[PDB]
Design a protein around this ligand. Structure first.
Ligand SMILES: [Zn+2]
Length: 280
């Protein structure tokens, strides 16, 4: 069922499913055979799939230090939101098996997300190159339909992403100075700023914040990213606002003080001027 006389995607039929992305993994290839459907049943039900890894595929996954993995995703055919921004959601309760082994809902990070809300790592249970693989999802008591996909994804590392932040135009000193003055105006002067990260409670090494952040206090981009990988909130640790990876930049002002202060100083006194002095 679909409109024969149209013009664009806006007017067609069945928006293609696209799982909400994470900067920690990148969907690279779809293993075609690994596509199952979960039906509506008041009892038990299951879907299986058999697939053999091609030459090109088995590779990325093989190597001992390979940043590639085979993830199984699940989403609803009729989600609350949009299929174009599909939430990862497996039916509950369920039991996933790969080549007769049960797959614990444990992957790299995302430890804050229950198992039904994150992809499943099939990789450590694949059979050798030339040898069919079997995946089986056992579910029960489903009121909605779900569709699963098998994707070879590339693990993106916290330090790799840090590189993207360092390669992003920093927040130049002039900006910080203008803010520091706008700040110091509303009074009843100097402000005390910490060189410590709110995330690590340790000396910062990569001072940062969203360019959208209205505050002097930065946080360590490395810790922020290691924190997001485990507990994906994507919220500033200081002002709690929503921040996107692309808007994360190093603060040149804070970086300067940090790269020119005694390894044991934990705070710095700032004057309307813009100059600073370590608080020993
Ligand atoms: Zn902020």
């Amino acid at each position: 069922t679909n409109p024969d006389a149209s013009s664009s995607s806006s007017s067609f039929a069945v928006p293609t499913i696209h799982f909400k992305e994470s900067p920690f993994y990148k969907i690279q290839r779809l293993i075609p055979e690994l596509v199952m459907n979960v039906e509506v049943t008041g009892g038990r039900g299951m879907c299986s799939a058999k697939f053999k890894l091609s030459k090109a595929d088995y590779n990325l996954l093989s190597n001992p230090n390979s940043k590639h993995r085979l993830y199984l995703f699940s989403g609803m055919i009729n989600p609350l939101g949009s299929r174009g921004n599909e939430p990862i959601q497996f039916p509950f309760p369920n039991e996933l098996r790969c080549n007769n082994v049960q797959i614990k809902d444990n992957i790299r990070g995302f430890k804050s997300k229950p198992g039904t809300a994150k992809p499943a790592d099939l990789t450590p249970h694949l059979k050798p190159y030339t040898q069919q693989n079997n995946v089986e999802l056992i579910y029960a008591f489903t009121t909605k339909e779900y569709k699963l996909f098998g994707y070879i994804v590339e693990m993106i590392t916290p330090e790799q992403l840090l590189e993207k932040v360092l390669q992003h135009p920093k927040i130049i000193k002039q900006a910080t100075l203008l803010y520091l003055k706008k700040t110091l105006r509303e009074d009843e002067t100097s402000t005390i700023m910490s060189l410590q990260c709110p995330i690590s409670y340790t000396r910062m090494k990569y001072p940062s914040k969203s360019i959208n952040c209205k505050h002097l206090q930065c946080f360590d981009a490395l810790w922020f990213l290691h924190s997001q990988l485990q507990i994906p909130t994507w919220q500033c640790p200081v002002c709690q606002i929503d921040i996107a990876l692309e808007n994360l930049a190093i603060s040149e002002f804070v970086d300067d003080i940090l790269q020119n202060c005694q390894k044991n100083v934990e705070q710095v006194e700032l004057t309307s001027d813009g100059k600073w002095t370590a608080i020993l």
